[PDB]
Specification:
The structure is a homodimer. The first copy, chain A, is an alpha/beta fold and about 575 residues long. Chain A has 20 helices and ten strands. Chain A folds into three domains: about 180 residues, Up-down Bundle (ABC transporter transmembrane region fold); about 110 residues; about 230 residues, P-loop containing nucleotide triphosphate hydrolases (Rossmann fold), CATH 3.40.50.300. Chain A is about 60% helix and about 10% strand. In chain A, the strands form three sheets. In chain A, strands 2-1-4-5 form a four-stranded antiparallel beta sheet. The complex binds ligand JSG. Chains A, B: InterPro entries: AAA+_ATPase (IPR003593), ABC1_TM_dom (IPR011527), ABC1_TM_sf (IPR036640), ABC_transporter-like_ATP-bd (IPR003439), ABC_transporter-like_CS (IPR017871), ABC_transpr_lipidA (IPR011917), P-loop_NTPase (IPR027417), Type_1_exporter (IPR039421).
Chain lengths: ~575, ~575
C-alpha cells in the first residue's frame, strides 16, 4: 500500500531528507551529550582538577541548542511533507468523490466521508511520519549510543550488544501478550456498555410498568461487571510495564556483574562506566519506540488502505458522449425498468411515458415508486437497469453526463447554496461568463430582488457558511433565477416547495410560468394547484401509470384529488 | 467540584491510602537508585572494592523489583478506587436518570447521555486519579531527589533549589502561551474543515449544475488553508519543547559553572557529582508533571461538574399521593391546556373530553397537535401545564405516579423489550407477585404461543437485546401479553400505525377485543376499523373537539374516511 503511496510523497523528498538529516543530528546530539560525561568524570572531578569544567557548560548549552534547533527543523520539515502529502491526497479524494456515482454518496457512506477526508488523511500522514521519525531518530540514537559505548568500553559493550536484542525481544513478547489480553476486555466492556444503553432508552415502558427498581438492580449488576472488567484491563496494562522494567534491570545487573571482574575493570575509569550506564538508561526509549514503530506504520498504511479503496472505487460511467445543447425534443420513457440500489425488486416498474415538448406534464407518486425516482432518471442519477430512455432521439446512456445534466435543471428549496458569492451561486460555472448585466437581468426576473437587497450588497454579497442564511423560499427563487439565467431546456419540479410562503409562492409561480411558457417541463407534485394549471397529467404510482389522463379524467377517478 | 465529590470517594479511602504509600515507595526506589550511583563511582570504580560491585547488582534488581511491585500496587489499588467510585457514580446517575421526567430524556439529552454515564464518569475517576498519581508520586520524587542531593552535595543543591522554581515557571509560561496559540489555530482548522464538509454535501447540485471545476478549485483553496493552519499549529506546538529543554539546559550549565569554582563547590567526588546530575536529569519529568497536574485535575472536576448538573437536575414531580388500584372511572378532561415543552405554547387547546367508563372511545389527530400527547396525559409523561384531569374522583396531579401509571397500560409498536427473560419481560415489576402458572396463562391468552413455544425454554427463555429478536408484530404480541397479565384498567392503545399482518394482526385483534371486552380504553387510530368497533368516537384535531359523534356521524364527517 505504501508501495502505491510513495508517488504522492516523492515530489516532496526534500522535506523528508532534511528531516532525516536533522533527526540524525538530534540523535548525535544526544550521543555527544552523553559522551561528554567521561571528559567530566575523568578530567574534572576526576584526575585533572579543572580546565574542563568551564568549556563544558558552554558545550552543554551548545549541544542543547543543537537539539532544539534540529528538533524544530525536523518537526517543521516533516510536518511540511505531511502537509503537502495530506493536502494532495485530500484533494485527490475530493476530485474522485465528486465524480463518483450518486449511489455511493446516497447513504452507501455519507457521514463517514468527511472523516475519510480529514481524519483519515491526517492519520495516514501522521502515522507514517511518526514511523519515520521513530525509525530514523531512534535508530540513529541506538547506533550513536552503541558507537559511544564501543569507543569507550569495548568489554561491557559486547555484553550489551548481546542483551539489547534480548531486551527488545522481551519487550515485544510481553507487550504483545498483555496488549492482546487488554483488547479482549475492551469488547467485554463494550458489551456491558451496550447493555446500559439498552436500559437507558427504555425510560418509557419503565415508568409505565414501575420496573424502575428492577432497572436499578440490573444496572447495578452491569455496572459491577463493567467495573470488574475495567480493573482486569488496567491490571494487565499495568503489569505490562514493571515486567519490562525488570527484564531491563536484569541486563543492568548483568552488566554491573560483568564490570566487577578484574579483567574488565582497570579499564573502566570513573567516567567510562558513567558513560556506559547513561547510554544504557538512554537505550530504553529507542528499543520500545522501534517495537511500536512496526505497528504505527501499519496503522498508517491501513488508513491509507481505506483511502485507496475510496480512491479506486468505480467512478460514474461516462462511456456515452452524445452531446445536446437545447433539447426541444420530447423526453420518451419507453419500456424502462429500474431498481433502487440496495433493493432487489425493481422500484421503478417497466413503464412508458412521453414528455411532450413545451408541456408541463406532471405525475403523483404517493405509493413511493417514481415519487422522486423519475426525476433521477433524466439527470442520469442512479442508472437505468433496463430500457432505453430515448431523450431527443438517443438514449440517456449515449448522452454525455455533463451536457445532459446541463440540459436539465432541478429546482427546490432544499438546494444548498455554495459558499461563493450569491451572484456566482446563481452563475455557478457560469461565472467568469454570463456578464453581471445578465446576472442583474436574472435577479430581476427572479422576483426575489427584495431578499438579496435585504442583506448586504445583493449581487456582491456572499451566502457563505451562514453568510445571510436565505430562507427556503428565497433559496428556491435563487435556484429559479439560476435556471432562467442558464436557459435550461428542461425543468424538473417536486411539489414546488414543502410549504407556501408570503409573496414567495406568488413569485415562484410568476417565475415558473416565465420558465414553463416554453420549456419541456416534466413535473411531480402532490399539491394539485399547478396540476390544475397544467395541460397534461399522468398519475404514476408503484412504478405503474395508475391513470394517464388529464384533469378531467383525473377528476373522473379522483383518488386523492380532494384533500 | 471535588468538594461535593469527596463523599463518594471517602468510603474507599483504604485504596487511596495504599496507593499513596505505594507511590511514595516508588519515588523512594527511584531516589535510592540514583543514591546507589554514588557508591558505585566513589567506592567502586574509584577506590577499587569488588565488594561493592558484587553487592550492587543484587541491589539494583531488588530496587527495580520493589519499583515494579509498588507500581503494580498503585495501579491496582488506585484503579480499585477509581473503579468503585466511577461505578458508584454511574449507578447514582442511572438511579437519578429514571425518575427524571421524560422531558429531559426527550430531545434535551438523547445520545449524549450514553457518554454522560460511561465516558463522563471515567473522565472524572481517571482524571482525578491521574492528578493524584502525579501529585503524590512526582512530589515524592522531587522531595526524594532534593534530599538525596542535599545529603550528598548541599552546595549545588542550594543553586538547584534556587533555579528549579525558575525552570518550573518557565515551563508553565511557555506551555501555556504555546498551547493557547495551538487552540487558536485549532479553531480556524475546524472552521475550515466545516467548509469542505458543506462542499461535499452539495453533490447533487455540483452534478446537475456546474462541472465540478469550481468545486475542485475551491476545495483546493480550502485544503491549502487547512495545510497552512496545520503547519502553523505544529510549528507552535513543537517550539515549546526545544525552549523548555533549553531553559533546563541553562540550569544545567549554571550548575556546572557553579562546580569548578575554587575549592568551595569543588568538594564533590565523582560519585557526588554523578548523583547530583542524575538527580537533576530525573528531576525534569517530575517538574513538568507537577506543572501540568492542574489541567488534568480541572478537566476531571469539570466532567464531574457535568455529572453533578445531571444528578441534581429536578427529578419528576411526584407530590400527588392519591392511590388507585383499579379504575373503572372516566378519565375526565376539562379545559386542560398543556404546551409541548420547548415549543408551541398554544398546544392542546382548552379541551373537554369525558371518556365513559368501560368504553373504547378514540380520536383522530391528523392535524399533528395534541394527538399522541393525550396518551401522555393519562400516563402523565409530559405533565399538564394548566388544567385538571379528573380521574376517578381525583386529579392526576393528586394521584401517585406509580399507581397512575400502574392503572394505565400502553401497547405500541415501539415498546422496548428488557434484556431479561421473556417471562420477566411479561412479569417486569410483577415477577415476585405472579407465578409461572399465571405467566403460562398469560402466554396462552397472548395469542403468541406459536412464537413463544419455539424458543429454548418457553417462559424461561431470553428475549434480550439481539438474541431471539422478536419482530414488531411479536413486540405487539408481547405488549398485549403484558396487558393480558390482568393488571391494567385503562388500556391506552396506540394503533396509530394500524398495520395489518399475516395472522399476527389477526391474533393481536382477537386478544385485543378480548381485553376491550371489559377494559376502559382510549385509542388514536388512523384506520377506521376502530371507529367501526368504537363505542363513542371523539375526533380531535389541533387539540379541539371538532365532533363527538357516533360511527354514523363520523361517516358524515368523512374527511379522509374514503382512505
Ligand atoms: C539493555 C538494553 C537497554 C538497556 C536499558 C537498561 C537500563 C534502563 C534502566 C531501567 C529502566 C528505567 C527507565 C528510567 O530511566 O527510569 C527513570 C527514573 C530513573 C530511576 C532509576 C533509573 C537509573 C538509576 C541508576 C541505576 C544505576 C545505579 C524514569 C522512568 O521510568 O520513565 C521512563 C522514561 N525514561 C526516563 O524518563 C529517563 C530520562 C531521565 C531519568 C533518568 C535520568 C538520570 C538517571 C540515571 C542517569 C544515567 C545512569 C548513570 O532520561 C533518559 O531517557 C536518558 C537519561 C540518561 C542520560 C544521562 C542523564 C544523566 C547523565 C548525568 C549523570 C550521569 C522513558 O520515557 C521518558 C522519556 O521522556 C522524555 O522525552 P522528551 O524528549 O522530553 O519528549 C525524556 N527526555 C528528557 O529529555 C529531558 C532530558 O532527559 C533532560 C534534559 C534537561 C537537562 C536538565 C534537566 C533539568 C534541569 C533543571 C531541573 C533542575 C526522554 O529522555 C530521552 O530519551 C532523551 C535523551 O536520552 C536525553 C539524553 C540527554 C539528557 C541530558 C544529558 C546530560 C549530560 C550530563 C552533562 C555532561 C525519556 O526517555 O520510557 C519509559 C516509558 O515512558 C513513557 C513513554 O516513553 O512512552 C512516557 C509517557 O508517555 C508520554 C506521555 O503520555 O506523556 C507519551 C509518549 O508518546 C511520549 O510523548 C512521552 C514523552 O517522551 C514524554 O515527554 O510521554 C508515559 O505515558 C509513560 C507511561 O508509563 C506509558 O506506560 O510512557 C519510562 O518508564 P515508565 O514511565 O515507568 O513506564
Amino acid at each position: 500500500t505504501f508501495r502505491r503511496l510513495w508517488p504522492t510523497i516523492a515530489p516532496f523528498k526534500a522535506g523528508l531528507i532534511v528531516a532525516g538529516v536533522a533527526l540524525i543530528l538530534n540523535a548525535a546530539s544526544d550521543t555527544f551529550m552523553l559522551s561528554l560525561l567521561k571528559p567530566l568524570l575523568d578530567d574534572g572531578f576526576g584526575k585533572t582538577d579543572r580546565s574542563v569544567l568551564v568549556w563544558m557548560p558552554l558545550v552543554v548549552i551548545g549541544l542543547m541548542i543543537l537539539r532544539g534547533i534540529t528538533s524544530y527543523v525536523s518537526s517543521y520539515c516533516i510536518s511540511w511533507v505531511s502537509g503537502k502529502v495530506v493536502m494532495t491526497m485530500r484533494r485527490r479524494l475530493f476530485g474522485h468523490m465528486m465524480g463518483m456515482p450518486v449511489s455511493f454518496f446516497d447513504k452507501q457512506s455519507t457521514g463517514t466521508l468527511l472523516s475519510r477526508i480529514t481524519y483519515d488523511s491526517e492519520q495516514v500522514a501522521s502515522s507514517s511520519s511518526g514511523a519515520l521519525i521513530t525509525v530514523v531518530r531512534e535508530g540513529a540514537s541506538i547506533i550513536g549510543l552503541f558507537i559511544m559505548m564501543f569507543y569507550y568500553s569495548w568489554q561491557l559493550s559486547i555484553i550489551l550488544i548481546v542483551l539489547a536484542p534480548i531486551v527488545s525481544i522481551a519487550i515485544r513478547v510481553v507487550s504483545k501478550r498483555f496488549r492482546n489480553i487488554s483488547k479482549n476486555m475492551q469488547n467485554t466492556m463494550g458489551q456491558v456498555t451496550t447493555s446500559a444503553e439498552q436500559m437507558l432508552k427504555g425510560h418509557k415502558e419503565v415508568l409505565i410498568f414501575g420496573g424502575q427498581e428492577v432497572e436499578t438492580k440490573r444496572f447495578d449488576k452491569v455496572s459491577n461487571r463493567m467495573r470488574l472488567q475495567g480493573m482486569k484491563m488496567v491490571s494487565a496494562s499495568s503489569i505490562s510495564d514493571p515486567i519490562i522494567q525488570l527484564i531491563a534491570s536484569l541486563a543492568l545487573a548483568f552488566v554491573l556483574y560483568a564490570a566487577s571482574f578484574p579483567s574488565v575493570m582497570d579499564s573502566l575509569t570513573a567516567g567510562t562506566i558513567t558513560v556506559v550506564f547513561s547510554s544504557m538508561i538512554a537505550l530504553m526509549r529507542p528499543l520500545k519506540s522501534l517495537t511500536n514503530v512496526n505497528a504505527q506504520f501499519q496503522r498508517g498504511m491501513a488508513a491509507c488502505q481505506t483511502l485507496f479503496t475510496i480512491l479506486d472505487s468505480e467512478q460514474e460511467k461516462d462511456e456515452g458522449k452524445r452531446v445536446i445543447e437545447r433539447a426541444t425534443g420530447d423526453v420518451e420513457f419507453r419500456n424502462v425498468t429500474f431498481t433502487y440500489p440496495g433493493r432487489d425488486v425493481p422500484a421503478l416498474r417497466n413503464i412508458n411515458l412521453k414528455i411532450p415538448a413545451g408541456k408541463t406534464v406532471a405525475l403523483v407518486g404517493r405509493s413511493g415508486s417514481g415519487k422522486s425516482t423519475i426525476a433521477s432518471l433524466i439527470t442520469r442519477f442512479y442508472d437505468i437497469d433496463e430500457g432505453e430512455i430515448l431523450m431527443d432521439g438517443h438514449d440517456l446512456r449515449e448522452y454525455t453526463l455533463a451536457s445532459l445534466r446541463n440540459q436539465v435543471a432541478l429546482v427546490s428549496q432544499n438546494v444548498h447554496l455554495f459558499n461563493d458569492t450569491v451572484a456566482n451561486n446563481i452563475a455557478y460555472a457560469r461565472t467568469e461568463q454570463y456578464s453581471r448585466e445578465q446576472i442583474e437581468e436574472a435577479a430581476r426576473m427572479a422576483y426575489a430582488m427584495d431578499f438579496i437587497n435585504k442583506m448586504d450588497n445583493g449581487l456582491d454579497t456572499v451566502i457563505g457558511e451562514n453568510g445571510v442564511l436565505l430562507s427556503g423560499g428565497q433559496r428556491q427563487r435563487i435556484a429559479i433565477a439560476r435556471a432562467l439565467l442558464r436557459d435550461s431546456p428542461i425543468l424538473i419540479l417536486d411539489e414546488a416547495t414543502s410549504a407556501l410562503d408570503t409573496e414567495s409562492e406568488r413569485a415562484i409561480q410568476a417565475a415558473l410560468d416565465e420558465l414553463q411558457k416554453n420549456r419541456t417541463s416534466l413535473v411531480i407534485a402532490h399539491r394539485l394547484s399547478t396540476i390544475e394549471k397544467a395541460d397534461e397529467i399522468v398519475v404514476v404510482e408503484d412504478g405503474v401509470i395508475v391513470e394517464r389522463g388529464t384533469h378531467n379524467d383525473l377528476l373522473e377517478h379522483r383518488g386523492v384529488y380532494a384533500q
